[PDB]
Tab-separated table of C-alpha atoms and ligand atoms in Angstrom:
chain	number	residue	atom	x	y	z
A	7	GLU	CA	27.722	0.260	8.769
A	8	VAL	CA	24.747	1.984	7.000
A	9	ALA	CA	21.333	0.276	7.519
A	10	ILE	CA	17.956	1.329	5.983
A	11	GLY	CA	14.346	0.459	6.744
A	12	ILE	CA	12.133	-0.504	3.784
A	13	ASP	CA	8.355	-0.752	3.712
A	14	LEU	CA	7.851	-3.120	0.707
A	15	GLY	CA	4.188	-2.190	0.168
A	16	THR	CA	1.489	-3.745	-2.023
A	17	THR	CA	0.997	-0.546	-4.082
A	18	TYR	CA	3.764	1.786	-2.641
A	19	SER	CA	7.184	1.249	-1.074
A	20	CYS	CA	9.065	3.653	1.203
A	21	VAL	CA	12.672	3.874	2.464
A	22	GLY	CA	13.914	5.540	5.635
A	23	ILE	CA	17.178	6.003	7.563
A	24	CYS	CA	17.621	6.573	11.294
A	25	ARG	CA	20.796	8.486	12.119
A	26	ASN	CA	21.536	10.294	15.394
A	27	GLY	CA	18.042	9.281	16.596
A	28	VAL	CA	16.402	11.236	13.783
A	29	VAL	CA	14.519	9.447	10.970
A	30	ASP	CA	14.732	10.725	7.401
A	31	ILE	CA	12.184	9.357	4.889
A	32	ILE	CA	14.056	9.581	1.581
A	33	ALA	CA	12.487	11.139	-1.552
A	34	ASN	CA	13.070	9.445	-4.943
A	35	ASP	CA	14.215	11.103	-8.295
A	36	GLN	CA	10.807	12.738	-8.765
A	37	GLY	CA	10.676	14.143	-5.204
A	38	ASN	CA	8.202	11.441	-4.063
A	39	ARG	CA	8.546	10.183	-0.478
A	40	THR	CA	6.922	6.821	-1.553
A	41	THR	CA	7.526	4.888	-4.801
A	42	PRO	CA	5.009	2.677	-6.619
A	43	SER	CA	5.713	-1.088	-6.295
A	44	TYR	CA	5.553	-1.265	-10.131
A	45	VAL	CA	7.939	-2.827	-12.649
A	46	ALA	CA	7.413	-2.359	-16.391
A	47	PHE	CA	9.151	-3.853	-19.421
A	48	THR	CA	9.160	-2.033	-22.808
A	49	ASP	CA	10.823	-2.608	-26.248
A	50	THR	CA	13.878	-0.673	-24.918
A	51	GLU	CA	13.937	-0.501	-21.089
A	52	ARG	CA	13.005	-1.812	-17.621
A	53	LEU	CA	11.153	0.861	-15.608
A	54	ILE	CA	10.666	0.816	-11.815
A	55	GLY	CA	8.509	3.016	-9.616
A	56	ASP	CA	6.972	6.247	-10.879
A	57	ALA	CA	8.121	5.700	-14.487
A	58	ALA	CA	6.525	2.203	-14.498
A	59	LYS	CA	3.207	3.366	-12.937
A	60	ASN	CA	3.076	6.394	-15.288
A	61	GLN	CA	3.074	4.231	-18.467
A	62	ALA	CA	0.747	1.492	-17.042
A	63	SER	CA	-2.287	2.398	-19.207
A	64	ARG	CA	-0.091	2.440	-22.392
A	65	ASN	CA	1.580	-0.909	-21.614
A	66	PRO	CA	-0.887	-2.914	-19.442
A	67	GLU	CA	0.384	-6.361	-20.401
A	68	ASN	CA	4.016	-5.668	-19.469
A	69	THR	CA	3.480	-3.521	-16.353
A	70	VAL	CA	3.675	-5.648	-13.204
A	71	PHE	CA	2.238	-4.658	-9.803
A	72	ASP	CA	0.682	-6.617	-6.841
A	73	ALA	CA	3.682	-9.020	-6.688
A	74	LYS	CA	3.190	-8.880	-2.845
A	75	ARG	CA	-0.105	-10.808	-3.416
A	76	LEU	CA	1.884	-13.615	-5.106
A	77	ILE	CA	5.195	-13.617	-3.155
A	78	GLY	CA	5.804	-16.952	-1.379
A	79	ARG	CA	2.510	-18.389	-2.659
A	80	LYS	CA	1.799	-21.520	-4.721
A	81	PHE	CA	0.060	-20.589	-8.004
A	82	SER	CA	-2.753	-23.085	-7.156
A	83	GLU	CA	-3.758	-21.220	-3.919
A	84	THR	CA	-7.353	-19.880	-4.038
A	85	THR	CA	-6.105	-16.364	-3.313
A	86	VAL	CA	-4.122	-16.353	-6.579
A	87	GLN	CA	-7.107	-17.680	-8.629
A	88	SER	CA	-9.323	-14.964	-7.199
A	89	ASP	CA	-6.827	-12.045	-7.473
A	90	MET	CA	-5.690	-12.803	-11.028
A	91	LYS	CA	-8.941	-11.379	-12.522
A	92	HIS	CA	-7.605	-7.916	-11.477
A	93	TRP	CA	-4.286	-8.301	-13.408
A	94	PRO	CA	-3.751	-7.277	-17.027
A	95	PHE	CA	-0.383	-9.129	-16.970
A	96	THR	CA	-0.094	-12.888	-17.455
A	97	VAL	CA	0.654	-15.217	-14.507
A	98	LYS	CA	1.067	-18.978	-15.002
A	99	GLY	CA	2.200	-21.831	-12.735
A	100	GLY	CA	5.659	-23.326	-13.041
A	101	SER	CA	6.576	-27.023	-12.638
A	102	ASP	CA	7.717	-26.150	-9.062
A	103	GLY	CA	4.152	-24.771	-8.391
A	104	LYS	CA	5.488	-21.200	-8.085
A	105	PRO	CA	3.835	-18.325	-9.977
A	106	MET	CA	5.641	-17.099	-13.120
A	107	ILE	CA	4.838	-13.559	-14.274
A	108	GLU	CA	5.101	-13.411	-18.099
A	109	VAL	CA	5.992	-10.175	-19.885
A	110	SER	CA	7.605	-9.064	-23.165
A	111	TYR	CA	10.947	-7.191	-22.771
A	112	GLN	CA	12.907	-6.003	-25.862
A	113	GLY	CA	10.742	-8.165	-28.164
A	114	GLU	CA	11.343	-11.319	-26.082
A	115	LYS	CA	9.068	-13.376	-23.782
A	116	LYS	CA	10.437	-13.227	-20.175
A	117	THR	CA	9.195	-14.911	-16.947
A	118	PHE	CA	9.784	-13.833	-13.359
A	119	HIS	CA	9.029	-15.242	-9.946
A	120	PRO	CA	7.229	-12.794	-7.606
A	121	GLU	CA	10.400	-12.392	-5.496
A	122	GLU	CA	12.318	-11.298	-8.641
A	123	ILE	CA	9.782	-8.506	-9.278
A	124	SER	CA	9.942	-7.551	-5.570
A	125	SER	CA	13.788	-7.614	-5.723
A	126	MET	CA	13.586	-4.926	-8.473
A	127	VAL	CA	11.406	-2.726	-6.242
A	128	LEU	CA	13.819	-3.299	-3.327
A	129	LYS	CA	16.820	-2.486	-5.568
A	130	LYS	CA	15.152	0.810	-6.578
A	131	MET	CA	14.571	1.691	-2.871
A	132	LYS	CA	18.221	0.770	-2.089
A	133	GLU	CA	19.275	3.156	-4.947
A	134	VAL	CA	16.968	5.920	-3.655
A	135	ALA	CA	18.790	5.734	-0.267
A	136	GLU	CA	22.216	5.482	-1.968
A	137	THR	CA	21.638	8.610	-4.115
A	138	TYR	CA	20.664	10.517	-0.956
A	139	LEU	CA	23.584	9.238	1.170
A	140	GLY	CA	26.116	9.377	-1.678
A	141	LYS	CA	27.391	5.984	-0.394
A	142	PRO	CA	26.527	2.291	-0.995
A	143	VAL	CA	23.959	0.678	1.393
A	144	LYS	CA	24.114	-3.042	2.276
A	145	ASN	CA	22.038	-3.589	5.427
A	146	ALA	CA	18.262	-3.356	5.677
A	147	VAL	CA	15.216	-4.203	7.737
A	148	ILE	CA	12.262	-5.151	5.498
A	149	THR	CA	8.665	-5.227	6.774
A	150	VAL	CA	5.862	-7.691	5.977
A	151	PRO	CA	2.195	-7.979	7.079
A	152	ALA	CA	1.722	-9.720	10.450
A	153	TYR	CA	-0.331	-12.520	8.751
A	154	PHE	CA	2.520	-13.419	6.297
A	155	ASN	CA	3.467	-17.078	6.678
A	156	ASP	CA	7.005	-18.542	6.703
A	157	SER	CA	6.989	-18.984	2.908
A	158	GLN	CA	5.938	-15.357	2.299
A	159	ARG	CA	8.548	-14.059	4.794
A	160	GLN	CA	11.334	-16.189	3.335
A	161	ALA	CA	10.504	-15.175	-0.250
A	162	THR	CA	10.542	-11.474	0.875
A	163	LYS	CA	13.988	-12.061	2.509
A	164	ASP	CA	15.191	-13.759	-0.741
A	165	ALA	CA	13.946	-10.700	-2.731
A	166	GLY	CA	16.188	-8.578	-0.467
A	167	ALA	CA	19.213	-10.852	-1.044
A	168	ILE	CA	18.662	-10.726	-4.830
A	169	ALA	CA	18.538	-6.868	-4.556
A	170	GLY	CA	22.013	-6.919	-2.898
A	171	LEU	CA	20.759	-6.270	0.629
A	172	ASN	CA	21.865	-8.080	3.746
A	173	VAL	CA	18.504	-8.438	5.444
A	174	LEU	CA	19.145	-7.875	9.148
A	175	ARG	CA	15.554	-8.832	9.946
A	176	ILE	CA	12.029	-9.218	8.545
A	177	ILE	CA	9.603	-7.492	10.968
A	178	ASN	CA	5.809	-7.002	11.075
A	179	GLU	CA	4.276	-3.866	9.560
A	180	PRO	CA	2.023	-3.086	12.599
A	181	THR	CA	4.978	-3.506	14.948
A	182	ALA	CA	7.107	-1.181	12.755
A	183	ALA	CA	4.349	1.459	12.923
A	184	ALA	CA	4.236	1.161	16.750
A	185	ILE	CA	8.052	1.455	16.977
A	186	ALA	CA	7.892	4.654	14.787
A	187	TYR	CA	5.729	6.307	17.477
A	188	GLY	CA	8.155	5.277	20.286
A	189	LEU	CA	5.318	3.363	21.971
A	190	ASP	CA	7.939	0.781	23.155
A	191	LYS	CA	9.782	3.512	25.102
A	192	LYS	CA	6.916	6.021	26.017
A	193	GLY	CA	5.613	5.668	29.578
A	194	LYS	CA	5.683	2.163	31.143
A	195	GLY	CA	3.440	-0.823	31.958
A	196	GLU	CA	1.241	-2.811	29.558
A	197	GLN	CA	-0.090	-0.835	26.596
A	198	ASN	CA	-2.795	-1.993	24.164
A	199	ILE	CA	-2.063	-0.538	20.720
A	200	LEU	CA	-4.466	-0.689	17.753
A	201	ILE	CA	-2.844	-0.283	14.310
A	202	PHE	CA	-5.418	0.751	11.675
A	203	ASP	CA	-3.701	0.295	8.277
A	204	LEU	CA	-5.738	1.144	5.160
A	205	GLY	CA	-3.476	1.333	2.091
A	206	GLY	CA	-4.110	1.124	-1.646
A	207	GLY	CA	-5.231	-2.470	-1.836
A	208	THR	CA	-5.449	-3.871	1.706
A	209	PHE	CA	-6.922	-3.163	5.091
A	210	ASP	CA	-5.189	-4.544	8.168
A	211	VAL	CA	-6.130	-4.056	11.799
A	212	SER	CA	-3.733	-5.363	14.451
A	213	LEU	CA	-4.023	-5.304	18.212
A	214	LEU	CA	-0.612	-5.234	19.891
A	215	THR	CA	0.408	-5.478	23.487
A	216	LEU	CA	3.602	-3.941	24.721
A	217	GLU	CA	5.061	-4.900	28.073
A	218	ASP	CA	8.698	-3.925	28.857
A	219	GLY	CA	9.821	-2.920	25.339
A	220	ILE	CA	8.466	-6.170	23.887
A	221	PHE	CA	5.662	-6.018	21.250
A	222	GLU	CA	3.307	-8.941	20.764
A	223	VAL	CA	0.628	-9.245	18.066
A	224	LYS	CA	-2.472	-10.353	20.003
A	225	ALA	CA	-5.049	-10.366	17.195
A	226	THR	CA	-5.255	-9.398	13.508
A	227	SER	CA	-8.153	-8.922	11.099
A	228	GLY	CA	-9.054	-6.851	8.023
A	229	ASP	CA	-9.823	-7.316	4.383
A	230	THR	CA	-7.158	-8.153	1.768
A	231	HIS	CA	-9.338	-6.403	-0.871
A	232	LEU	CA	-10.362	-3.122	0.718
A	233	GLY	CA	-8.207	-0.102	0.091
A	234	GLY	CA	-7.928	3.179	-1.761
A	235	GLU	CA	-8.308	1.405	-5.145
A	236	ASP	CA	-11.852	0.360	-4.134
A	237	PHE	CA	-12.764	4.027	-3.313
A	238	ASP	CA	-11.314	5.013	-6.759
A	239	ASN	CA	-13.574	2.296	-8.312
A	240	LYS	CA	-16.604	3.862	-6.570
A	241	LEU	CA	-15.776	7.156	-8.353
A	242	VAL	CA	-15.093	5.315	-11.672
A	243	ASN	CA	-18.485	3.455	-11.508
A	244	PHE	CA	-20.260	6.777	-10.758
A	245	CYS	CA	-18.490	8.607	-13.664
A	246	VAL	CA	-19.295	5.737	-16.069
A	247	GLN	CA	-23.007	6.135	-15.198
A	248	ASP	CA	-22.793	9.948	-15.301
A	249	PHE	CA	-21.243	9.774	-18.833
A	250	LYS	CA	-24.197	7.522	-19.891
A	251	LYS	CA	-26.750	10.144	-18.661
A	252	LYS	CA	-24.846	12.940	-20.476
A	253	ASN	CA	-24.119	11.149	-23.778
A	254	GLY	CA	-27.236	9.106	-24.653
A	255	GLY	CA	-26.302	5.788	-23.029
A	256	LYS	CA	-22.661	5.637	-24.275
A	257	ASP	CA	-20.650	3.101	-22.197
A	258	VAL	CA	-17.047	4.015	-21.274
A	259	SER	CA	-16.592	0.597	-19.584
A	260	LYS	CA	-16.462	-1.135	-22.999
A	261	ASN	CA	-12.996	0.493	-23.565
A	262	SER	CA	-10.365	-0.578	-20.978
A	263	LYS	CA	-8.041	2.345	-21.907
A	264	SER	CA	-10.956	4.790	-21.234
A	265	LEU	CA	-11.520	3.167	-17.809
A	266	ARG	CA	-7.796	3.348	-16.870
A	267	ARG	CA	-7.585	7.038	-17.839
A	268	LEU	CA	-10.770	7.775	-15.859
A	269	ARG	CA	-9.393	5.807	-12.838
A	270	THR	CA	-6.215	7.948	-12.871
A	271	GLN	CA	-8.318	11.140	-12.605
A	272	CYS	CA	-10.685	9.607	-10.024
A	273	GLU	CA	-7.760	8.841	-7.722
A	274	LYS	CA	-6.421	12.451	-8.080
A	275	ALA	CA	-9.871	13.893	-7.221
A	276	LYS	CA	-10.108	11.527	-4.170
A	277	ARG	CA	-6.782	12.857	-2.840
A	278	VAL	CA	-7.931	16.498	-3.313
A	279	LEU	CA	-11.167	15.662	-1.412
A	280	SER	CA	-9.057	14.813	1.700
A	281	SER	CA	-8.146	18.523	2.105
A	282	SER	CA	-10.832	20.332	-0.026
A	283	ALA	CA	-14.666	20.265	-0.066
A	284	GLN	CA	-14.829	19.742	-3.880
A	285	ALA	CA	-12.760	18.414	-6.778
A	286	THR	CA	-13.094	18.149	-10.559
A	287	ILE	CA	-12.722	14.900	-12.524
A	288	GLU	CA	-11.786	15.779	-16.098
A	289	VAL	CA	-10.767	13.523	-19.000
A	290	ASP	CA	-10.408	15.122	-22.415
A	291	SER	CA	-11.509	12.786	-25.265
A	292	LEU	CA	-12.431	9.992	-22.829
A	293	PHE	CA	-14.548	7.802	-25.150
A	294	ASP	CA	-15.593	8.404	-28.807
A	295	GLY	CA	-13.651	11.712	-28.734
A	296	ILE	CA	-16.108	13.026	-26.113
A	297	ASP	CA	-14.680	15.212	-23.329
A	298	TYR	CA	-15.757	14.339	-19.781
A	299	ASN	CA	-16.046	16.703	-16.820
A	300	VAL	CA	-17.796	16.389	-13.423
A	301	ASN	CA	-17.593	18.107	-10.026
A	302	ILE	CA	-17.473	15.805	-6.972
A	303	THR	CA	-18.145	17.183	-3.502
A	304	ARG	CA	-16.609	15.504	-0.414
A	305	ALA	CA	-20.225	14.683	0.639
A	306	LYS	CA	-20.858	12.790	-2.644
A	307	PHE	CA	-17.578	10.830	-2.304
A	308	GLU	CA	-18.551	9.976	1.314
A	309	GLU	CA	-21.994	8.824	0.102
A	310	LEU	CA	-20.569	6.557	-2.669
A	311	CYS	CA	-18.121	5.008	-0.128
A	312	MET	CA	-20.425	5.142	2.962
A	313	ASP	CA	-20.721	1.367	3.498
A	314	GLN	CA	-17.047	0.680	2.750
A	315	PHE	CA	-15.911	3.372	5.205
A	316	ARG	CA	-18.280	2.190	7.986
A	317	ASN	CA	-17.302	-1.460	7.397
A	318	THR	CA	-13.685	-0.617	8.361
A	319	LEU	CA	-14.962	-0.759	11.980
A	320	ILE	CA	-16.018	-4.435	11.617
A	321	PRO	CA	-12.360	-5.780	11.703
A	322	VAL	CA	-11.682	-3.350	14.605
A	323	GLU	CA	-14.559	-4.965	16.578
A	324	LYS	CA	-13.285	-8.418	15.536
A	325	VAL	CA	-9.687	-7.891	16.863
A	326	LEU	CA	-11.057	-6.531	20.151
A	327	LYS	CA	-13.381	-9.590	20.446
A	328	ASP	CA	-10.505	-12.044	19.568
A	329	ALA	CA	-8.194	-10.359	22.092
A	330	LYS	CA	-11.049	-10.443	24.680
A	331	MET	CA	-10.814	-6.715	25.402
A	332	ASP	CA	-12.996	-3.604	25.406
A	333	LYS	CA	-12.416	-0.628	23.065
A	334	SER	CA	-11.855	1.537	26.197
A	335	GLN	CA	-8.718	-0.560	26.965
A	336	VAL	CA	-6.941	0.672	23.773
A	337	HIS	CA	-4.189	3.179	24.810
A	338	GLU	CA	-3.129	4.254	21.280
A	339	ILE	CA	-4.786	4.084	17.824
A	340	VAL	CA	-2.130	4.448	15.084
A	341	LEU	CA	-3.271	5.483	11.600
A	342	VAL	CA	-1.156	3.798	8.871
A	343	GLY	CA	-1.641	3.695	5.064
A	344	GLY	CA	-2.383	6.470	2.613
A	345	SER	CA	-6.176	6.026	2.827
A	346	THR	CA	-6.195	7.024	6.523
A	347	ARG	CA	-5.842	10.640	5.177
A	348	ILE	CA	-9.609	10.489	4.326
A	349	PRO	CA	-11.348	12.742	6.862
A	350	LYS	CA	-14.447	10.510	7.104
A	351	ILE	CA	-12.300	7.508	8.050
A	352	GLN	CA	-10.513	9.505	10.773
A	353	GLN	CA	-13.888	10.706	12.105
A	354	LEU	CA	-15.399	7.186	12.132
A	355	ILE	CA	-12.389	5.762	14.086
A	356	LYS	CA	-12.409	8.692	16.575
A	357	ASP	CA	-16.179	8.267	17.194
A	358	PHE	CA	-15.743	4.484	17.592
A	359	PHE	CA	-13.053	5.048	20.254
A	360	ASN	CA	-15.289	7.578	22.077
A	361	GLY	CA	-13.421	10.695	21.016
A	362	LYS	CA	-9.875	9.389	21.435
A	363	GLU	CA	-7.524	11.140	19.023
A	364	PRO	CA	-5.592	8.688	16.835
A	365	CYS	CA	-1.811	9.010	16.465
A	366	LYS	CA	-1.297	10.430	12.947
A	367	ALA	CA	1.700	12.833	13.441
A	368	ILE	CA	3.810	10.674	11.087
A	369	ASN	CA	2.663	10.653	7.375
A	370	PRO	CA	0.608	7.426	7.447
A	371	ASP	CA	2.135	5.986	4.284
A	372	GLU	CA	5.658	6.510	5.879
A	373	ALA	CA	5.151	5.205	9.456
A	374	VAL	CA	6.128	1.598	8.579
A	375	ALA	CA	9.364	2.598	6.817
A	376	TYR	CA	10.023	5.047	9.721
A	377	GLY	CA	9.742	2.191	12.252
A	378	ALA	CA	11.772	-0.209	10.079
A	379	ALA	CA	14.518	2.476	9.876
A	380	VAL	CA	14.544	2.784	13.686
A	381	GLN	CA	14.801	-1.017	14.036
A	382	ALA	CA	17.600	-1.108	11.387
A	383	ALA	CA	19.615	1.467	13.368
A	384	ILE	CA	19.074	-0.485	16.644
A	385	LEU	CA	20.211	-3.737	14.965
A	386	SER	CA	23.316	-1.890	13.693
A	387	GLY	CA	24.336	-0.835	17.266
A	388	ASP	CA	22.969	2.735	17.157
A	389	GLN	CA	21.072	3.484	20.412
A	390	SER	CA	20.375	7.207	19.637
A	391	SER	CA	16.617	6.809	18.874
A	392	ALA	CA	16.096	5.466	22.481
B	1	AN2	N1	-4.492	12.398	0.545
B	1	AN2	C1	-5.041	11.188	0.322
B	1	AN2	N2	-6.359	10.944	0.428
B	1	AN2	C2	-6.895	9.735	0.143
B	1	AN2	N3	-6.173	8.689	-0.273
B	1	AN2	C3	-4.832	8.812	-0.387
B	1	AN2	C4	-4.168	10.070	-0.039
B	1	AN2	N4	-2.848	9.888	-0.144
B	1	AN2	C5	-2.662	8.617	-0.559
B	1	AN2	N5	-3.852	7.978	-0.666
B	1	AN2	C6	-4.094	6.586	-1.046
B	1	AN2	O1	-3.206	5.707	-0.370
B	1	AN2	C7	-3.106	4.485	-1.117
B	1	AN2	C8	-1.632	4.066	-1.062
B	1	AN2	O2	-1.318	3.857	0.308
B	1	AN2	P1	0.143	3.510	0.856
B	1	AN2	O3	0.027	3.364	2.349
B	1	AN2	O4	1.268	4.352	0.283
B	1	AN2	O5	0.466	2.190	-0.002
B	1	AN2	P2	0.469	0.639	0.367
B	1	AN2	N6	1.549	-0.242	-0.600
B	1	AN2	O6	0.797	0.394	1.885
B	1	AN2	O7	-0.875	0.230	0.000
B	1	AN2	C9	-3.560	4.871	-2.523
B	1	AN2	O8	-4.831	4.256	-2.773
B	1	AN2	C10	-3.773	6.379	-2.503
B	1	AN2	O9	-4.877	6.861	-3.298
B	2	CL	CL1	22.257	3.183	10.373
B	3	CL	CL1	22.759	12.936	3.879
């Protein structure tokens, strides 16, 4: 009976349920409405979500994340060779050509396929819904990026099966976001929908057409390496240089633990800057027992990220060009992904679309799970959302 919608995200995952036409996004044990797509292995336990992300800087080698960049891929693909520089954990190729993530768990060397790591994230999201409902959950709709190939979709479905879920369907993330806003029901006639999805690691723009309750992905573009983590890195690079000017050329970047601790505080300041004009980045005993403190204005953050923010419009122009349509022909602009909370990004998109207000009523990092939950309820025979 009970079916959930799961956004299996690169950096964060989210679980929703649609009952009586109402969608509840379910909070985890820590009260978080999204859960990090992190899995860590220690001498005693296997941590998933918040607990895994929280100990990442203390256990870099055995804390896995970014499995979505490896799922359904051959280890030899150029994408894997390029991305692996960003991972403190070890990834090797198996005799079947599949990636094998190598960690230490309880003093033993263990290997996992990307779909096994993703199955642990999915199992945690299943448990988050189960704790809320007080009942077991078997059915689910899981989302994937529109550009995911058959191998990536099938490996994501397999991750669901391993997690104990009966995957009703694998659907596209941009389509799930459009379904969340009821754009398939609302009004009538052909509608051109632009989904602007800027998450923690990726940027995806998708141009959809909707005629008679049927969504079609006309064109997609973006950048698989542009997200919130790149804006955090702009703050990290600035702080590293600021520390040098304050402490006679001392270089924080030589210590990877100092960088990780600084990155944690840079991301917190970035979030504050979405609703405040200023924020403080503070790390006690950052490097060589030296305390670090700096005040960052929203203007300074905007300046450090200026080119990256403006360049988000390039894939918007590209999808419009590929779909052979003018920006004036876009009926709805849906903001998806946690980074769309950045005021400058919202302003740039609004100005590009000549003052058109983007649809952002749903928490952008929840809209995909919200749409997947609606689709899960429809596929279970519940027509109340319509
Ligand atoms: N209030 C906020 N302002 C700026 N950035 C924010 C934010 N709230 C969340 N974010 C960013 O959103 C990113 C995560 O986005 P989300 O949509 O949940 O994850 P995902 N797996 O789709 O990448 C992180 O980089 C985080 O810093
Ligand atoms: Cl249901
Ligand atoms: Cl309930």
